[PDB]
Amino acid sequence: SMEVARAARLAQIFKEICDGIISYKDSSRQALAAPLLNLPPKKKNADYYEKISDPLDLITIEKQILTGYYKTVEAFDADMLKVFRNAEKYYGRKSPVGRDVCRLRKAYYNARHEASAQIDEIVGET
C-alpha cells in the first residue's frame, strides 16, 4: 500500500489511544491525564523549563497525530512516554501526579498491546 494511506490508518489508531489517555477517569470521575494536557506557561513556571529539557504536552501530541507527523509507532511511543517521564521527573514518582502518571502508563501499555495486531498488519504491507 501507499505510505500516506498507511500513515493515516496509523494516525487513526494513535488518536484512539491518545484519546483514551486524555479521557481516562478513575472510578472517582476525575481526569487523571489533566495535569499532562498543557505545558505550564513559561512566564510563571521558569523553574519547569530549567528542570525539563525536552518538554511536551498531550495537546501537542494530539495535534501532531492529525498531521500524520507520526510515521512509526516508535515515534509515537517515544513522545507519549516522554510526556510521562517529564511528569515524574518534575513532580516525583511519589507525588499525586506521579501516582496518576504511573497508572496512566498501565492504561497506555494495554491500549498499545491491543492495537499491536492492527499496527503490524499495516506496517507489514511495506
Author numbering: 2431 to 2556
Show me the paper's own sentences about this structure.
BRDs are evolutionarily conserved and present in diverse nuclear proteins comprising HATs (GCN5, PCAF), ATP-dependent chromatin-remodeling complexes (BAZ1B), helicases (SMARCA), methyltransferases (MLL, ASH1L), transcriptional coactivators (TRIM/TIF1, TAFs) transcriptional mediators (TAF1), nuclear-scaffolding proteins (PB1), and the BET family (Muller et al., 2011).
The 61 BRDs in the human genome cluster into eight families based on structure/sequence similarity.
